[model samples]
Target: ADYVLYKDATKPVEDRVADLLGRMTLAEKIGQMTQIERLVATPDVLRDNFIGSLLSGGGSVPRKGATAKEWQDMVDGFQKACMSTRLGIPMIYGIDAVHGQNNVYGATIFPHNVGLGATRDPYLVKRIGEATALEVRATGIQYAFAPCIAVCRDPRWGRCYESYSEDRRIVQSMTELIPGLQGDVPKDFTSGMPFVAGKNKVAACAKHFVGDGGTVDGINENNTIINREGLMNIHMPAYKNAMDKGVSTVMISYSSWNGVKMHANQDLVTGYLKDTLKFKGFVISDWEGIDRITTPAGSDYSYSVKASILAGLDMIMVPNKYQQFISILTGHVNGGVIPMSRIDDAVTRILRVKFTMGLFENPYADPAMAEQLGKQEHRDLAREAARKSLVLLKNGKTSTDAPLLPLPKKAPKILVAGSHADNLGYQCGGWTIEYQGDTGRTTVGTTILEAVKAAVDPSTVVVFAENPDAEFVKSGGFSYAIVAVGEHPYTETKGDNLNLTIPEPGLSTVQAVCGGVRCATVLISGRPVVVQPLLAASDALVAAWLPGSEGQGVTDALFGDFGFTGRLPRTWFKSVDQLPMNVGDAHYDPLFRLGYGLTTNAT
Candidate 1:
């Protein structure tokens, strides 16, 4: 066996990266800068094209309901193919493990970022990141496109739920997940350098770079109009925090900053982020992000290719059109359109991450890690997160009155009614089993109704109705009712809403059940919806922002098993008219101010 300098585990990452870079061909270097989706990432394609990375997009898995073993097998197969290449430089597998190893079935899905944001517990978020890393590794993945550090300024954004908070401070605090995902950096580690501790850990990405969340009216992939000061203050601080924590990668947003596409903004990408901020990790493009540089999107492919690479994007998530991308980039490079310096820089960064992740020495999945998926410990952590994430908005019909929660668990008859009460998929929300997320038993988890049943006394009669009418509520002689309802699962463009109102049957259920009985309204949603209008009818109100998989955590607070601690991560706007209003804005009249959460004690 040959003792290759790049293959030595004890060598510095920089040395390994440089040694590997010196041995690569122009085509191979170009390939190192390319990332494609799993659907088109055949073994032959991986070997022939020398692909550097592969990602399983939301719901893009080996197969539906794929087990941890199945996922590992699929990823290992891809690694084997990449290793067979001339350089045998292993390709890293990336997935949107934003909230736990969410793409794989049976993996413990944690509460979404909005919910975690409410906890304001960076330590908990970090623990979640640690748990998530283990679960991700169980499936043989090395990269996670997670901890979306977007400071979502408006709930209207479809991906608002992905952000930790509307406040950059809170978003910055939550960057603890980076170390938890990649493992904590040593005291002597450089500030902006990428670091992944070991096999149990995976590389973490601080995503959508600048101003993806501050778009006009919260439009998906729309222009974010903000001055440089505002950008640096609100949207840019989290990236600094991410880099400080030694985040492994940064994903470029599809949105624009002051009419300039981020994928083509060399001033910010190269000048600010790369040079000014001194980020050492590679910058990756969002899905088909470069194609979106032009208005019609992919209209000027050649120009987009030139602009994005020149703008300092290291890896192009070409997704499907790899050959076309390779040809265009190659042509530009050979024709003196794109400089060799840029190509070398991109490849060097890519290899740095690979070597830092220890991919050269150990590139394949460990079968033992498959047992880590959906483990009891991870599920318990998710349950605790769910408990801490819940915000008690209203505790009684009127202020200065006794709290309505800590409800009697021994009641003879209790009514649980709403569209979301019995649904697991609604509780888990989007980016679960599918991209937009599906309904009814989407994965293994306790429903709010199930949690309620488990918490109440054995003698208590728990009746469930998806949409109980006023007559049923009044005639049933229910001691009290639990009405859980809010927005169904949604993601990206599909979730954008102007009205921000609770969907049908949800609003009607709240009105009908609450009006007729002493009811506690449990709102399960990604972000704040129209709750002020329903405030009068409801005896108590709770914001359970998409508590994933662990329904008992909700009941833990409701039944006084645990106390309410979560506060408003975003302002609960009185109306959509106050659209874009945040904490510091003039005339910032919100129904409930940011950081507002009613408190309760466990019985």
Candidate 2:
């Protein structure tokens, strides 16, 4: 059968995008710009409305414990509906697969960005990107809302763990993940065009453009107060790096730059990002990102639609309210409030990405690729990531004393106590099975307690306790104690902490177990918490920032199977009073400075 120029795979992507754009109606163009949630997406709705994309928000799944097949079925079902439409334009599905394909059950969840940042290994990050892409593609999704290239200036930011580091250079280095997700561009490929190699690779998004990480006092969705030079120097370099790697999409931040909301800021989004930096990929709005432009959120829908579209956002993650978004945007375009030029530009970029992704030629999911999810090789990669991401904060009670890590695996009796030790949810932290990740075995993963048991000798008797009291520790006469504790799983605004102290029984558990016996404290936190207060009591300390899924890696380092190579990605602030302290700040006082890590030898 003869195919149209737009449908021909061999034609240049630009010509196909242009051909497709010419054939699309105003309604079809509008649909291409609107992305809705899976819960609201139905075959009839997608076919009739011409919805362009669907996303599984944090915890948004087809069913509880949905396997890769279930995920693929759900996505394929949606794609089939879009294909049945008049134009048969394929819809791209998106998910927040930030650290591995995290939204899927049993997918290999790797270390979060902060943990990987501690490793300071860009090549390892690139490998993780490749693994994540395969897992994401396994679920039949085409886009990922990830590689949050934010230069988190303060650890107080609830989303600090998502940021690779407080330093821009580190964030830039970590952009190697873009290639891993999108597949490396060809030697002669254009600098800014979106590029995806084939079926296994998925489109990568460089997210929350501009200063989401530099918000005032690290407040979530708050203002980032910095001048032009400061913004360019601190927060903008990573986007350039991502574009250089030919990232397919860019997601606008919910946070504001200076006093202007990023969603409404045309200067940075269109002027600098698109024109100056010459970004060729389409710009996407965050979940309800456009709605949050107003104080009451979606209060002034018309104004938000006009501002954001005119400001150069190509797609709106309308999520649940696609009708309202479509109606308002349609009205705006028809009345000339938003020009057709802008509309055409947005649709052109969107189609370019779809064409580049080979969606038109290959719109359906391959059942064979579903087997790639949670493969052993991917888990092994996560295990290695977990091992290298561990930062050894303290090795001994005193400078001249013996190091406590590389702990003996042959001890007669060992006490493992603390909230995070036995809990897989706590170890994985936020963005796990649930949004603000839950406690207990939320997903399949080795907990620190399990890893401890596995690492120790057969004769070794290990006692596990969530919170052991001083008397219990003394009565047990354990050879040594391991206390794993830190911040509970949290996400976005919910994780914002003013005190930044270890919560509840975690502090008490540390005091009791360490005071009673020689102990090594393992902090399973997103960022540095109040460590100085409890530092002297613990003989050694390890900053194990949110090592997802593979807990064996934690034990591999602790038991001398592997050496600790991770460093402090963010400053270990002595107190919360030093609110915005960083490596470059004039005050520059920290319990342990940025890049500080202790070395160890395998026993």
Candidate 3:
């Protein structure tokens, strides 16, 4: 075989990418830009089609009891097939490790970003990135579509948990995760450039390119109508911060800017992100993003392809239809509907990231590093994060100033009531084990009830009830009832709520417990819910904010093991009628104002 310039690891990435691009046929180049979901991709499919990328969507995972070694074996099998081709370009694997490597069972799932934002500690966020990076790599995946920098202007948004804060400045500060995951920023790193240290670290993606959070009425993947000034000033700062931090990839939003679909918006995707912002990283679309380009959905598949490619989407997340995508894109290129220059640009960008990731040299899973998955240190770190993220919205007081919380660590009897008190699935919220995360011990994690038991005196009797009427609470003769209630596990479009009210049994549970005992209600939710009625009934309230798998952290703060340090990341609304009311709104009126949190006397 002749010597290949790209094969030598000693060659500069630029020279290697150029030489590789020069050798590739048009079919190979197109395959390099297509990212397919792993379920539909057999090893033979990767072998025959020269598939470039694979991803496990929200809940996608290997079979049950699939250990770290199994995950490595699975990825390794697919990788061998990719290497069998002529040029043998190694395929990149991606996963939505949004809050830790959450898809895998037993992974140390951390508190989602909404809670992290409350901590207002970017340094901690960076540490989280470090831990999350290790867990993601242990799965044999190299790319993480995480650290969503969407500046959530409205809490009603289904994906608000994904955003750090409504303020651009907070989101900007939290971009520190880019360096944490990808490694320390290079001395010569430029804003709008991509960087990922070789295999030890996985590439970080700063996502939803422009304004997925500013949608009207917090609608998911809806239109974001705003002026250029609004876009430049409000939503664009985080991307700029991510760019300066050398983020490696950007996922385009499904939401529209003004009236244009982001998938078809060349002025922004190609002109602004690529040219004006000088983003060197490849642009990947959201799940089935291109297919949703037309209103009726797949109204014009060929046109969607033409528009998205011309608009400069580097990789199409075709998801399930790999062969169909190849056929469509190939036809577009040959017929001159989509230019060859655009195709080359997309392929070159993909190759550039692959070389930067050092996949060409080290393409298989590292079995030695498999132990890093859900390591104890990561769990401890997650616990610490959860503790800091708790905001004491209301720390008990009857008519007077005397606080009700910091309940005796030696209480004789305690009552823990409500659906969420013992449910690990509810505490972790959405995107835990499944896409629309299911309830009831989905994975191994301490429940709040268990944490409460651990915190109090060992001899202290603890009564538990999912729903207790006034009679049950009074009959138990509880010292105080602890009511935990909040939203069920949900993700993406399914979580958006126009009503924004606490659902059925949760509100009823709060009513019953508070009416019977001097109870402190802990609200475990992605965002603030309408709680004025319950707030009046309860002596105290705690905004737990979806403290993930680490349940001890919730009790750690409750028992004054750690003082309450978190403040409300978003304003708490009195009612859904006051929807879209943010901290800076002209008529801003919130039940618990932004930055509100109370501390224990010890603190």
Candidate 4:
């Protein structure tokens, strides 16, 4: 009792956890299983409750333009409060570092998963993971809810851009990112065990545990109606692959299966994932996930709390009401409605991860890592990722004709038209600066307009117009145009759209530019949008799916520094009706079939 085994690094993880559990009270155990968002949390909250984890839901930064040092200080302040507790247990901080350390002001922002999926190169994806981990550490955060391995069956789902591919096989391959984030699994790897390599690396979470992308009508948080076979085959494989890679955590999906919310699905959560698959990592609920179990979130709160826990949710992300949640859950345990054995099981998983991560030994931000934020090398890698992810859906009027791309680096004049060409926020898309991402110079990096200037001949002229009307294109007398058009910034739920058309002015911008001058249209968007009407006017069409912060990559392919190598990750539909259509179906004809792309020198 004089020496705590859990605090001693020399002790075996199993012995350490056993000792820690014996010491923790029921209140402490429930607190360990609770995760609260940053905005609502305070230092006293950490000390009062044994809060084990803290998260910054998208857009939740320390302050506007908060520096790396500021981020480090903010997280450390929270950590200091936890240390002040009698237990002195360090809390793990998690964020949606989904694409780079996107929440931070200066952190590098890499392409979203859809763009990476287009690259079809796991090696590059793995490197991106390594770079992202470094950036996350630079900010003093220890966990990333990333590598969203959702197998999106329908593009209509707003979160489609978050998925690596429509095919589970491709997403399975991208699991290479797991090792890159949370260090490689040991040579003799075991499933259902916590395994994080070391301090430099952060824990990785495979999110939306099941079928978030298969929601009916591609509705957000809607039910996925399917037989067990389709569920096991199409959606569940990525989790299997992720487990093999030693992912440290799994986040329950906001969506449901067969009309049952995943948060309350005991069969899949405790039975299938924990027992059958032997997954050892802790299972976390999505943001305010349990509250939504009963319609109009927070309604029937007591039941929602009881049901989610009984359903085997190890960690509850009660972003706001931690006290209420803890009181309710604590009441359930005392009432015998929830078993103490269940509480112990959840705490065991939580302690196992903290031990696995070596948080006790080295718990603060390594000030040295601060330099890694937005390092030039990472930007270069991001540029490479962005460039490689560009899918040339149409290179010219004919597939077998001289391509319009690899435009001469030294044209007399290049007219850059459309809303996206010059905007960092547009190119970065959602989950940067703020949730449901906004448009502006929200962060730093080269814009496509800037890249065109840098890549073109020093003597070349570049004119940028947010919306170049027919008169401007006709009067400019330029050497062709580079029209960048596509969806504005958006995130899950709010982003879902049935029309999926190019938002106004953009389509007209393309028509005007291409009408007067031959053009290469770079579509900067999250997923494939409705582009049929504008296709005829575009000499070249490139799907630059949410290439975060590195517009130079779009220009890399645009000016031919890099060839168009990315194929469509999702089927480019002729219309929204064809949506749920993927690479393999009896009647699967699309505007551009899955895996379609044109190379620079293609005949």
Candidate 5:
């Protein structure tokens, strides 16, 4: 009987939530409350954690970069195992695709948030979102903890470039990212059922609930003490935009607001975000975030479980302590220390989100289209993004009026300097091959040095200098130099920058090369740096902000294959003296103004 079976279950948020809640059971309910780690838990352990949720916490991609079929096999292995329990509930998989489809090997890692903001094309951003979702699904991964809607007030924050802009409006414009991930707005209207893209189809998670990017002094887990109006105007708007776009998940911040940990704040977790904004989604804690919410880091699994759940957390991201958290949570529920209602509410919310994501309806992957992982078309998109995101600040004397970059293809000799130019690891930025990125070309990607060698004329002599000595470089009589400078892989504690200057080898490379001959410098950084010294040292400069996997894209622009066509998205601070300066300030003096750049058309 083929008939229209849709019910009024789609009318109100409460009705849909209640309708789904009616069908879940005890083990299925407990499974919803749990999230198993890719590193620690096995399929059997999913039942032990009562976990219907799974996630690949930083650097947990499967070996051999699983093809669409292998990805389906892997996910099906877990799903079939889960059905063995009392109720058949599908697991939801999550990964931090902070930039593009970052975790999977050969996934197209797009330009970071700062680069997207510079492009200022929301449509392009949405297309990137759709492409990311397709690539993510190609590997049988379901959820992406992305569209990090933090309005980074300070560049010193290690994850500053992860935010699209310092302005809430910029984050607001990115709201379209959710629809792209979830499928569409479901305009098939007499009934507005949420459209989820299947097991491979992704669910976007709007993160750090509120004001993670507004912490004082740009410190992680630091306090944010802004008034209510400022909170609504700045850090609060993006979450609402995400909510409107049907974002199904919200992850709490590792940061605090006004002396209170967000995981313990009922007003934010329960009252405002859930009540006012009507965010019908579940809130997951950040990785080991609740354990560090109190005095000492990693205090315990019990207290963190209690506080966050009581404060309206629907799910705790207990990445490693899988069994301990479940035992603790179980004991608390039995002893009445944690109310059964709270557990039910948390489990129900998790189930509803999983259901809304259509995990139960379609618990398998699309094997045919899964070959999209590492597709050449997607790589081309990443390359094009790299080309567009580049910001040109200065051009040499020959370039001052007519422009000097996309260097001449006919140049007989070219010097590719800087540690990063010849390295893929550093160029990919943080969260690459390892938990943090590596120092040089640790992964399999074309180095900028390789690109230059390929881009130049056969007679052109390309020199690779990993900090070439002054006399040695001069002896070659190199025609010009390119210094690739930026950061190596880093996670939370070690990355905060106080001085915001380029590293020594990068500094010394510039002085050693620039003092002897004219050169163009391409900086590979996550944030705008103290480039005043570099501007003094070089004839031309380009802000090559973390171009992942495509080293040739940069060489193409440098060797005149493509014109430098990028503009500064943020103010390039001259020194630490002008800390936190942006475009809106009345008395601003930046080395390069916001939106400043040299146009190739000027010639």
Candidate 6:
């Protein structure tokens, strides 16, 4: 079906692409490749330049719990505005549905990719992608900038948990997720795939194009100091698979590849992804991905834009500042600096992908899907995800049979402290209800503290304290403490990790509170980090990776309610000396081994 509609039309696909490109003026073609923020989807811009796409970066959307029909309507209204141009080009909506349709008010939020890799189930990840696409389409969005195939060599990178694994094998395995998003044509086009086929089986973008996760010290937007062969061997495999699957777009990373900024790199955008590998889709820049490009003049935006467009970027993610980009691009073209052939080539790629996505014939969302966005089933998926992502690092033992945890649910009153426990937004981690998801009731969801409270019986008096006064902890002592400690609300850039240590306040908070009370500790984090002091201090330890929107899921796993099944997906290091260590490395002496977890009989 893909072949029939997109490839085998009245003319060859290239001819069809050229046909669309041939019809557009330079402004129209340039606008078609340039994507802007949702608020900037004004009628004037649509009418004048015919911008081909719009996006909801993170927080951008209709109001929370707004139905799929609502999202579709908002998007279609914008599309109609864009199509009012001379060519009436339909605009495609793009978003950071990176983990799931995460930004939409009521969209399903899945476990971040790091957790998915723990499952070691490509089948589940693929199904997740399929379900994600359905949820995305229900809302009328057709583009998913997701399945970030970053092979995180350094866990300190704030987004290490976003990657499937340190091993490219896992990233390659998860490549099946792309098909899940852009479902196969099946026997019939309208019949769609078994799972939800987003309006037009939403296109998937394999992103941060190359070497984004392998940066030194896990710094955000920093250079990945790996050699070319090493890069091709480790980081390039999954992208190759995505290209083979015909991923609709490739997003340039904010980081550098082998010391050269990805947005400014000709060898990668042109030499590799474009020429040698034969990527047929358009290249879209990351959020302000272009501005990070370096030069002798100190990395100015204008220079970056000119260099990036000339470096073979088919599309720019100005997201905002469209007027500036249009002016600059128009200048570049008029000056004959950007060859008209390059302009045609860029627009041709953009049109080819859109046409292939079935946006031309029927470009609006199906109002029928309005009910499913962030519905109970989606929340249930979040719950299942939360349960699966928990990794137990320690069940401490005394010389006696006091090997900790599977905490006696019958225990009367337990002390619970730490800022994270009572907060829903903190438990959910970055990219929650907002672009950088907010804290404390950001959305209607359960907090880990609440989960623990509910887990205990009527008799248990679980104390709720944000930062319990030291005098308070000292005076009103209980049998034991259940402290939920972790990284607070964070997203990219601000999230880049220098040292894989839990945040300072949480570390001090955990030590101060837990040391006084004989306690079991649950460490909530995005990735395994240096927790030597905390590990040594605790009676029991659990690793809860950014469990989303569900407190009960954590409770269900705690208190011997469920057995611990997961081990470290990557090594839990004692320090950065263990840097670059994986399951295979000879010097790997992690605090916990890969695949190490304890199970209870009933649990």
Best by lDDT: 1
Q: Residue by residue across 45-129, what tens digits does model 4's lDDT show? A: 9989989999999889889999988999999999998888777788999999999999999888999999999999999999999
Instruction: List candidate 3 stretches off by more than 4 Å.
Output: 398-401, 601-603
Candidate 5 lDDT score relative to the true structure: 0.73
lDDT of each: 0.91, 0.89, 0.86, 0.87, 0.73, 0.75
Per-model TM-score, in order, reads: 0.98, 0.98, 0.97, 0.98, 0.90, 0.88
User: Per-residue error at 401 for model 6, in Å?
Assistant: 2.8
Candidate 2 residue-wise lDDT at 565: 91
Q: What are the runs in model 4 whose C-alpha is more than 4 Å off?
A: 399-401, 601-603
What are the RMSDs of all candidates, in order? 1.1, 1.2, 1.5, 1.5, 3.5, 4.4
Taking all chains together, the TM-score of candidate 5 against the true structure is 0.90
The weakest ten consecutive residues by lDDT in model 3 span: 395-404
Could you tell me the lDDT of residue 306 within candidate 4?
A: 89
lDDT of 3 by residue, 1-603 (tens): 778999999999889999999999988899899899889888789978889999988888887657777888888888998999888999999998888888888888899999999999999999999999899889899999987998887777888888878777888999998888898877877787678887778899998878887857775657865668668977888888888888889999888887899999999998988898898889999888898899787788888888899999999899898888899999999999899999989988899889987999999989888988889999899999999998887765555656777777787788998999999988998888778777888777889998898888877899999998889888887888888998887766785555777777988899899888888898888888887777778888888888888999988877777788898888888777787887788899888888888878543
Ranking under lDDT, best-scoring first? 1, 2, 4, 3, 6, 5
Candidate 5, superposed: residue stretches over 4 Å from native: 1-20, 23-27, 64-72, 188-195, 298-300, 335-341, 397-402, 442-444, 495-497, 560-562, 585-587
- Model 3 scores a C-alpha lDDT of 0.86
Error of model 5, residue 390, in angstroms: 1.0
| Model 5 RMSD vs true structure | 3.5
Residue-pair clash count for candidate 6: 4
TM-score of 3: 0.97
lDDT tens per residue, model 1, 1-603: 788898888999889888989988889999999999999989999999999999998889888788998999999999999999988999999999988888788889899999999999999999999999999999999999988999888888888899989999999999999999999999997788989988999999999888988857775757765778889899999999898899989999988887899999999999999998899999999999999999899899999999999999999999999999999999999999999999999998999988998888889999999999999999999999999999999888766777789898998899999999999888888999878788898777889999999889999999999997889889998999999999888987775556888788778889899888888998998998888867877889899999999999999999998899999999989888888888998999999999999989889
Lowest summed-lDDT stretch of 10 residues in model 4? 218-227
| Candidate 4: residue 288 lDDT (0-100) | 85
Per-residue lDDT value at 427 in model 6: 74
